[PDB]
Amino acid sequence: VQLVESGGGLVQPGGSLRLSCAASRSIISNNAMGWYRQAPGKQRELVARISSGGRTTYADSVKGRFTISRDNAKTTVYLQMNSLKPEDTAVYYCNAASLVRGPLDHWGQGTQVTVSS
Ligand SMILES: [Cl-]
Ligand SMILES: [Cl-]
Numbered sequence: 659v660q661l662v663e664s665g666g667g668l669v670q671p672g673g674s675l676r677l678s679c680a681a682s683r684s685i686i687s688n689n690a691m692g693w694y695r696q697a698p699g700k701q702r703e704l705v706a707r708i709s710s711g712g713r714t715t716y717a718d719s720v721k722g723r724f725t726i727s728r729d730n731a732k733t734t735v736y737l738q739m740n741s742l743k744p745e746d747t748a749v750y751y752c753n754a755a756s757l758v759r760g761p762l763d764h765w766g767q768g769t770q771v772t773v774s775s
Pocket of ligand 2: 667768
């Protein structure tokens with residue numbers, strides 16, 4: 659099960675990035691999917707989730723700024739990240755986000771996000 663992340667970058671505070679998570683339709687269409695992130699000195703944390711039925715939920719810290727979505731084909735999960743803050747700096751990873759099981763038993767390489775002057 660490949661999880662292929664892209665869309666990171668280095669931006670100024672107030673900037674934007676769009677992350678993409680490419681995976682098999684068998685995974686993305688049948689499971690809740692999430693975007694997670696991990697900064698130096700901190701644990702990995704879930705910041706956005708989209709249920710298999712399309713219901714979105716967000717960490718308080720990103721509400722109103724980040725939007726998670728699926729594409730038509732259900733082969734990419736996007737994270738639009740607007741109004742970026744220094745505190746958003748982290749490596750971002752996608753995975754399943756089951757309410758019962760959490761993520762899959764492995765992780766992709768992630769995509770790097772740095773928000774800095
Ligand atoms: Cl920028
Ligand atoms: Cl990267």
